[PDB]
Design a binder for this molecule. Structure first.
Ligand SMILES: [Mg+2]
Ligand SMILES: [Mg+2]
Ligand SMILES: [Mg+2]
Lengths: 241, 250, 233, 198, 244, 242, 212, 204
């Protein structure tokens, strides 16, 4: 019965609720995604407001939507769950009707579509979430990475970041990522990602989680130790000079 | 037309206060005093009949109500709200329990059902909370005797004795001194009468007081003979004369 | 004062006014002018069409509702589309079920009731368009003026829209003359154009500007646009 | 009805399912695979009414595939079967009931034991060493009852299914065009391409 | 019209925060503290009772610790009545899962579902949120002993030790101080109790003001045992640890 | 507060007017109608250089004979495009023919004022108007080449040339002067390119602008970057003359 | 009615007859039993005429919509399933259809799916459907080879329909042939069975028992 | 076509001296085809036993439904359901589906934990309760069991003797029913202990 127009135009042509949703994203942990020649890496910072967490169980920041596509986000954790669940259902519904898993653009267009609907439907407020969706289309090898925002707008990025301090790290990627030689290796792609997060996280090993997605449903979450090995090697290409 | 009030009327204020619930509790504070005392072999719930005129017939307004043959209720607050809560409670006793299990619900569960009705009035769209607090006393095979208080928020708690309404603070104090776990029902009726006398402004007698107990089974109030498993209701409202007889042994 | 009593149509002011309705009546006043007039044999609608730039079309003002009835609009066009659609349906039902042509008086009555519903309930909004309805039924020629408040009136001639008052005066003067233009369609139209040309100011009515519609005795509602209005300037 | 047999040996479950699809007077296809992998260690074979059969199987697969992803875990065969039973039992008093009989062979990675479940169109589930649907059991159960042993190897199971298929080919009236056999074990599900003659 | 009276419980503040959720969290901070501590061999749930008296029946009481399953329990911080609404839907979900799969519901699945319900009241419907925060203590065959927590926003997270309600900052600091990954339940009990004792807003920590529960896998059995401490048992364990 | 379908004291619907303001903040889109086709060009406007520009969809095919460009809150147009496409296909199914361009347009514009909170009249659920304008261009047998501008107010006008978006007042002024009944497709493409070049903040290249056209023979085709680069080059030269 | 479709080296051959009967009455000798879904996909009509005609013309619409949405050609697997799934929705209501959905896409190659009103959906290499199916299958099975030329293939299909038209009282009229390639289907004409029978008889020597 | 004759099976419950007994066969078949010889029809929720004969999918569904309902009951009430109470729950649950019933024949056996009085009850498929003081029979061999029980039964038998009685009632009733047998199980229930014994019987 509740259908009050919560997202409406104000005098200057803005929809506050959607704009305020963005502000919620600006407060969430940073997420970054950069793509290589045959991989896409998603990095995320761990909320450090409170500590004494059980890392085994706590909802991971990067989520598999299917065997070949993942989604990370910045914003309201609770809202992310709704989007992620809808995405996972649509992923299985696509396999059932089209007999082929979703492309990454398709999955993105779907999540974004849901986000937009919540901006012009009665009685609901927009999602305070922006997402990074990455993976590989079926039987294809070109990496994909897209970003969606509360308004329901979406597009693809060679590298992108969202969340708190993203403005800063976005600046790091804009002058450290070259489309002529995109990180030609899993190893160098990861390094670039960590480098970008290091410019914000403030010296913290366990503070960064990296997820590497390769072609044909090969998705792996690097361990706390595998990443520390990177931060170390990184504090070298900074201390030798 | 239509109930377009599909939004909450009770919402959290900046201090974490649920305004309408606090205000309902204030309504309960200005109501007549009601109390309940739990003994070893019974429970007594009592209240004063604040007749709003002498032309009114005070007997046609029962403040102490039977919910099930072994459970009774009394309140302090807005009378009409209590009246509808009683109807709903008598009904749910049937719909969520007797029609399923063939027996009346145990006190705590009936209490839990009334409480849920009150909580929803605290969150559902377009309604204000109930302005009443209830004291429900009852008995059941596996739990024995119990007394519970239910507040406008829907929170309920078990008591040995308690009082609600106007002089509840003073009364809760008189009860703390007099109460001990070796009291027989007649002693609780006594202490109930004493506690109430202090809250009562004017004439204190069997026509201005309402008391009921939950005690032994009363076969003379069953209405039939022949079936041995159902021995009679444990709820009994004391008559005008039964109260007077006890007031003289003050 | 106002933002207290003009937020919904469901609120009466202290003087008994319905502000949302009155604001709706204003959109009509900023619309392009349209005239309606009739004799005892034909009814004509003449309408000055408006454009946005000099690179666009001129928005249509006349809508055919059935072979014997139609209207000209002024104000919010989307709303005229909504109401002429209703009229089209009501006209259709009369024919389908009763094999009867809907009377103009009835069309007016139906329009009034549809408009009223939107002025007594909350959340809604009044219609923001005015309409001149002409038709030829069993009782002859008719012209009706509909206003969003739900008030529908039967007239000999009229006009609505910005500067409508000019033509409204010409018609009010020429009454004795046009009410007698029987059997001569072109003359009636000419009177309608003369009328409409009294509410001009900006430019002169051209071939991309004028829109006329006529209905009558042996004339099914027909819309003349551009090319075919040349002979009337 | 089609032929659906399953036999749980010591370290695996073998499902043998007929290859024909007959519609009226003509055999339309002779290479039909009446099975869907529900999870990497669970396979379900099915037999029944024309379209219901595949529609039901694909619906169960989709649903199990969704759970695996939401949870990042593979349900036990017992859990998958209970879910399947509840679905069949729902349709029995539905507007139009699914008429599908299924065999679920799965390898429980946790208990480290293979399991076979037989559930008919009504939602009648039973766990067994070997099972079948329709008339299949009528010819084969005497053979299974006689020769079956819980400590059989995968090869001993295959030899027994072969004998079972031979009795079916001798006494059963319709030409079911052979069977496609699949083995479910700790390493997953593999199709035994060698059964036409072993 | 009716728009006039709508508080708009599901809107974002100019800073991207949910008003009602923020205000509900404030209400929660006034509730008795509930603490949960996860050990290698069990979990402890301890909670301080709000609004008591000499006359309240502590024996027949339960306002903070509730059994959701034989393997899952929650500690509540906030409005008791709102909590009971949710607790009952959780109890049903646990049984729905058991019926469907014939296996006890994994802890995170129950937790996620409950949180999703809370989240809903956050994005649509126009109703005030539930003013409750839960600490879930539970066991399952996949992850063993677990402890989670959910708040009005519907966000949930996992912990080795956590507290909700009043004085969380203080309690969390003390927990993070004395907590060690290899703790034993007997040791967790002491810590939980110690922590409450130092954060209580009241005189001294007495039995009548507590609710205590442990979920242990007693080595001489197999099934996980959920034990809701009885008044006298809380008095007993309060002495051994040393608070008298 | 104040309702979503409330009229202003001037007779304008508040939400529609404000909608129009959101449209003034969007990328420019220009469409030019000739007698050999209708050109639709749009400014891509990426918010950063890491964005893969080819994923910016502001020109979309509605049907083989109808295409459209958008400006404003582009996400709002997704449901509009879905409707337009379904309307065209559906028309083909029911009538075994192509849907007229006006009809397709009108169908899209019917969605416009279908917003409100229980607005007594019919069932219109959409909490607010659309925040995007569309340029719909196409071809049909009865009226040839047409270009339409569909607004959130529900009104749509046919135009010989039209610009919408941030640089519209300026761009429309240029169009007013450069358009004539005898333009060629090639000339049109050039104009669109020129005018986009003028109002854009960034320097126009084949990666931040997009052209398209719709012709009777080949239908709606989005020009790939290579075809446009050549056209841009052909512009640098034609302008560098006098 | 007799309709067939088979897969080979150069695509798919689709051949159908064109007779419609109401009892013993030959309602039409010129029925179009191949529905041109779109320029790349074909469907055969068997069972209820309206049912096939209506739902396959509808299928064409759903296929056009997909391509607009996804900017990629619809696979035969997905196009067949749309119809198959729709038909399953109406199961039990009485729709009657036995159809072959034929296509040749880059991703799948020549693909044929048999779809009927019972909800069955089968991928296969050769399918004959209709009252004359048995007759067509005889010719097909004994002469089909994967390496047939597009000329011989077209001939095999045409001959198979003729075998059926001769023997089955409900098949005849004329034969309509189609060749499906990746770049679309190519129609190979309408052949009146009256005239085709005699030609084939003299050139091939078959149908000896028929005097002519 | 008779849902109560598709799968086969029987259950019998008897009361004794401070005890009750409930037994059942183990066959599950499909018309003439024996399918499983391990299909137990007796379930228990705490100390209350319920045997159910009839269509196997419903037997399984009802056990699951009662486990669900008795689990919630225990949580809300904080005590295990009693036989008298459960009996009412079964009856109300069956009548809820009065015009589309579960094709079963439930039987309840148990001892009240407060009073210690032995209890057994039987129901028809729509919930009618039969609270007998002697025995309850159900299944495809119900006539046979009635015959056996009416002759073999005598009041107040000790656990050790009731066992023999119920076992023989069951065993011989099953041997005259084509759809029953393939194994049998008997539960001897006492206040403190419950013993479960599998019987050796013909397998044809
Ligand atoms: Mg019987
Ligand atoms: Mg027998
Ligand atoms: Mg036998």
């Amino acid at each position: 019965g509740y259908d009050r127009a919560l997202s409406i135009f104000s005098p200057d042509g803005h929809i506050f609720q959607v704009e305020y949703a963005l502000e919620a994203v600006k407060r969430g942990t940073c997420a970054v995604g950069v793509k290589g020649k045959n991989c896409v890496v998603l990095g995320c910072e761990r909320r450090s407001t409170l500590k004494l967490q059980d890392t085994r169980i706590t909802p991971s920041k990067v989520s598999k939507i299917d065997s070949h596509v993942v989604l990370s986000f910045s914003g309201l954790n609770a809202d992310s769950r709704i989007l992620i669940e809808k995405a996972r259902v649509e992923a299985q519904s696509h396999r059932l009707t089209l007999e082929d898993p979703v492309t990454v653009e398709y999955l993105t267009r779907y999540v974004a579509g849901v986000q937009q609907r919540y901006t012009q439907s009665g009685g609901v407020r927009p999602f305070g979430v922006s997402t990074l969706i990455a993976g590989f289309d079926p039987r294809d090898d070109e990496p994909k990475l897209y970003q969606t925002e509360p308004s329901g707008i979406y597009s693809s990025w060679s590298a992108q970041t969202i969340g708190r301090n993203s403005k800063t790290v976005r600046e790091f990627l804009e002058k450290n990522y070259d489309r002529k030689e995109p990180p030609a290796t899993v190893e160098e792609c990861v390094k670039l990602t960590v480098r970008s997060l290091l410019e914000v996280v403030q010296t913290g090993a366990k503070n960064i989680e990296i997820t590497v997605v390769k072609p044909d449903s090969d998705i792996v979450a690097l361990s706390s130790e595998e990443i520390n090995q990177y931060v170390t090697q990184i504090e070298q290409e900074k201390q030798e000079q | 037309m239509t109930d377009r009030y599909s939004f909450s009327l009770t919402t959290f204020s900046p201090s974490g206060k649920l305004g309408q619930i606090d205000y309902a509790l204030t309504a309960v504070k200005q109501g007549v005093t009601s109390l309940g005392i739990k003994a070893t072999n019974g429970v007594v719930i009592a209240t004063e009949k604040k007749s709003s005129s002498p032309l009114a017939m005070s007997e046609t307004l029962s403040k102490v109500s039977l919910l099930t043959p072994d459970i009774g209720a009394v309140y302090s607050g807005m009378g009409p709200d209590y009246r509808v809560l009683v109807d709903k409670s008598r009904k749910v006793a049937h719909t969520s329990y007797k029609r399923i299990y063939g027996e009346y619900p145990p006190t705590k569960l009936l209490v839990s059902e009334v409480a849920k009705i009150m909580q929803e009035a605290t969150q559902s769209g377009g309604v204000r909370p109930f302005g009443v607090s209830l004291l429900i006393a009852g008995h059941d095979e596996f739990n024995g005797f119990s007394l519970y208080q239910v507040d406008p928020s829907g929170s309920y708690f078990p008591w040995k004795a308690t009082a609600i309404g106007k002089g509840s603070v003073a009364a809760k104090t008189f009860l703390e001194k007099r109460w001990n776990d070796e009291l027989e029902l007649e002693d609780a009726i006594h202490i109930a009468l004493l506690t109430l006398k202090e809250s009562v402004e004017g004439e204190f007698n069997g026509d201005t007081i309402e008391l009921a107990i939950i005690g032994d089974e009363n076969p003379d109030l069953l209405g039939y003979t022949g079936i041995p498993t159902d021995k009679g209701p444990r709820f009994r409202k004391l008559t005008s004369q039964e109260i007077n007889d006890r007031l003289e042994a003050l | 004062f106002r933002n207290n009593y003009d937020g919904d149509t469901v609120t009466f002011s202290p003087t008994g006014r319905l502000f949302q309705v009155e604001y709706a009546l204003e959109a009509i006043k900023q619309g392009s002018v349209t005239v309606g007039l009739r004799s005892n044999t034909h009814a004509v609608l003449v309408a000055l069409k408006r454009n946005a730039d000099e690179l666009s079309s001129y928005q249509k003002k006349i809508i055919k509702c059935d072979e014997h009835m139609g209207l000209s609009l002024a104000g919010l066009a989307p709303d005229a589309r909504v109401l002429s659609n209703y009229l089209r349906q009501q006209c259709n039902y009369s024919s389908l079920v009763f094999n009867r042509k809907l009377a103009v008086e009835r069309a007016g009555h139906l329009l009034c009731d549809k408009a009223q519903k939107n002025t007594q309930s909350y959340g809604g909004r009044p219609y923001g368009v005015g309409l001149l309805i002409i038709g030829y039924d069993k009782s002859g020629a008719h012209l009706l003026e509909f206003q969003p408040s739900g008030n529908v009136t039967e007239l000999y001639g009229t006009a609505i829209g910005a500067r409508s008052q000019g033509a409204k005066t010409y018609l009010e003067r020429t009454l004795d003359t046009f009410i007698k233009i029987d059997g001569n369609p072109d003359e009636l139209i000419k009177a309608g154009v003369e009328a409409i040309s009294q509410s001009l100011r900006d430019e002169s009515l051209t071939v991309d500007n004028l829109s006329i519609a006529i209905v009558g005795k042996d004339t099914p509602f027909t819309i003349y646009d551009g090319e075919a209005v040349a002979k009337y300037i | 009805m089609d032929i659906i047999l399953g036999i749980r040996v010591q370290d695996s479950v073998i499902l043998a399912s007929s290859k024909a699809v007959t519609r009226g007077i003509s055999v339309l296809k002779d290479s039909d695979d009446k099975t869907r992998q529900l999870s990497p260690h669970t396979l379900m074979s099915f037999a029944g009414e024309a379209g219901d059969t595949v529609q039901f199987a694909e619906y169960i697969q989709a649903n199990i595939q969704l759970y695996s992803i939401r949870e990042d875990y593979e349900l036990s065969p017992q859990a998958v079967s209970s879910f399947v039973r509840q679905e069949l039992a729902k349709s029995i008093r539905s507007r139009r009931p699914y008429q599908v009989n299924v065999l679920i062979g799965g390898y429980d990675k946790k208990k480290n034991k293979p399991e076979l479940y037989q559930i008919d169109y009504l939602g009648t589930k039973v766990e067994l060493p070997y099972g079948a649907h329709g008339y299949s059991g009528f010819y084969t159960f005497s053979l299974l009852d006689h020769h079956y042993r819980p400590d059989m190897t995968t090869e001993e199971g295959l030899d027994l299914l072969k004998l079972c298929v031979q009795e079916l080919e001798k006494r059963m009236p319709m030409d079911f065009k052979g069977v496609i056999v699949k083995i479910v074990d700790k390493d997953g599900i593999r199709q035994v391409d060698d059964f036409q003659a072993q | 019209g009716s728009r006039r009276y709508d508080s708009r419980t599901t809107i974002f503040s100019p800073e991207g925060r949910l008003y009602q959720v923020e205000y509900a969290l404030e209400s929660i901070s006034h509730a008795g503290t509930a603490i949960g501590i996860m050990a290698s061999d069990g979990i402890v749930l301890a909670a301080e009772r709000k609004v008591t008296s000499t006359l309240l029946e502590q024996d027949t009481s339960t306002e903070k610790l509730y059994k959701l399953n034989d393997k899952i329990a929650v500690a509540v911080a906030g409005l008791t009545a709102d909590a009971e609404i949710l607790i009952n839907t959780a109890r049903i979900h646990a049984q729905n899962y058991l019926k469907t799969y014939n296996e006890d519901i994994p802890v995170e699945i129950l937790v996620r579902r409950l949180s999703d319900i809370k989240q809903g009241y956050t994005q649509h419907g126009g109703l005030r949120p539930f003013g409750v925060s839960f600490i879930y203590a539970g066991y399952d065959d996949r992850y063993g002993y677990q402890l989670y927590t959910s708040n009005p926003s519907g966000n949930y997270t996992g912990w080795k030790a956590i507290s909700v309600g009043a004085n969380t900052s203080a309690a969390q600091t003390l927990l993070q101080m004395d907590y060690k990954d290899d703790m034993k339940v007997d040791d967790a009990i002491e810590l939980a109790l110690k922590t409450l004792s130092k954060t209580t807003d009241s005189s001294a920590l007495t039995y009548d003001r507590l609710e205590f529960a442990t979920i242990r896998k007693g080595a001489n059995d197999g099934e996980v045992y959920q034990k809701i401490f009885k008044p006298q048992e809380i008095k007993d364990i309060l002495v051994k640890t040393g608070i008298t | 507060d104040r309702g979503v379908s409330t009229f202003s004291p001037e007779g304008r619907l508040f939400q529609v007017e404000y909608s129009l303001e959101a449209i003034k903040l969007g990328s420019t889109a220009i469409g030019i109608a000739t007698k050999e086709g209708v050109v639709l060009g749009v400014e891509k406007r990426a918010t950063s250089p890491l964005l893969e520009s080819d994923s910016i969809e502001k020109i979309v095919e509605i049907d083989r004979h109808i295409g459209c460009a958008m400006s404003g809150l582009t996400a709002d147009a997704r449901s509009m495009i879905e409707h337009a496409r379904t309307a065209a296909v559906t028309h083909n199914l029911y009538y075994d023919e192509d849907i007229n361009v006006e009809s397709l347009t009108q169908s899209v514009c019917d969605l416009a004022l279908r917003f409100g909170e229980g607005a007594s009249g019919e069932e219109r659920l959409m909490s607010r108007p659309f925040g995007v304008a569309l340029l719909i261009a196409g071809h049909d047998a009865d009226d040839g080449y047409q270009l339409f501008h569909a607004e959130p107010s529900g009104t749509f006008y046919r135009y010989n040339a039209k610009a919408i978006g941030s640089g519209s007042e300026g761009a429309q002024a240029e169009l007013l002067n450069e358009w004539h009944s005898s333009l060629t497709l090639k000339e049109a493409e050039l104009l669109v390119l020129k005018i986009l070049k003028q109002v854009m903040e960034e320097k126009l290249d084949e990666n931040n602008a997009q052209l398209s056209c719709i012709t009777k023979q080949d239908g709606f085709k989005i020009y790939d970057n290579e075809k446009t680069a050549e056209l841009i080059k052909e512009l640098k030269e034609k302008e560098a003359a006098e | 009615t007799t309709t067939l479709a088979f897969r080979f080296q150069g695509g798919i051959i689709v051949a159908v007859d064109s007779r419609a009967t109401a009892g013993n009455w030959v309602a039409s000798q010129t029925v179009k039993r191949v529905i041109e879904i779109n320029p790349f996909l074909l469907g055969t009509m068997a069972g209820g005429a309206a049912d096939c005609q209506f739902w396959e013309t509808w299928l064409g619409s759903q296929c056009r919509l997909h391509e607009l949405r996804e900017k990629e050609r619809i696979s035969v697997a997905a196009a067949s399933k749309i119809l198959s799934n729709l038909v399953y929705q109406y199961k039990g209501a009485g729709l009657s259809m036995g159809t072959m959905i034929c296509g040749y896409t880059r991703k799948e190659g020549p693909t044929i799916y048999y779809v009927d009103s019972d909800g069955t959906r089968l991928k296969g290499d050769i399918f004959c459907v209709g009252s004359g199916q048995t007759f067509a299958y005889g010719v097909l099975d004994s002469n089909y080879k994967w390496d047939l030329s597009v000329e011989d293939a077209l001939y095999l299909g045409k001959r198979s329909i003729l075998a059926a038209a001769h023997r089955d009282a409900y098949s005849g009229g004329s034969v309509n042939l189609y060749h499906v390639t990746e770049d679309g289907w190519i129609y190979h004409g309408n052949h009146d069975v009256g005239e085709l029978f005699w030609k084939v008889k003299e050139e091939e020597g078959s149908f000896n028992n028929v005097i002519g | 076509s008779d849902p109560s004759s598709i799968n086969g099976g029987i259950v019998v419950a008897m009361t004794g001296k401070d005890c009750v007994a409930i037994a059942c066969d183990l066959r599950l078949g499909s018309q003439s085809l024996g399918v499983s010889n391990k299909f137990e029809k007796i379930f228990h929720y705490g100390h209350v036993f319920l045997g159910i004969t009839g269509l196997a999918t419903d037997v399984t569904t009802l056990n699951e439904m009662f486990r669900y309902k008795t689990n919630l009951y225990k949580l809300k009430e904080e005590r295990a359901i009693e036989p008298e109470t459960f009996t009412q729950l079964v009856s109300s649950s069956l009548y809820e589906r009065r015009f589309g019933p579960y094709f079963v024949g439930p039987v309840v056996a148990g001892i009240n934990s407060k009073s210690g009085k032995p209890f057994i009850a039987g129901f028809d498929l729509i919930g009618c309760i039969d609270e007998a003081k002697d025995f309850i029979v159900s299944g495809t061999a119900s006539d046979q069991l009635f015959g056996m029980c009416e002759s073999l039964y005598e009041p107040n038998l000790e656990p050790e003797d009731l066992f023999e009685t119920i076992s023989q009632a069951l065993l011989n009733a099953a041997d005259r029913d084509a759809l029953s047998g393939w194994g049998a199980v008997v539960y001897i229930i006492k206040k403190d202990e419950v013993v479960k014994r599998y019987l050796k019987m013909r397998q044809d």
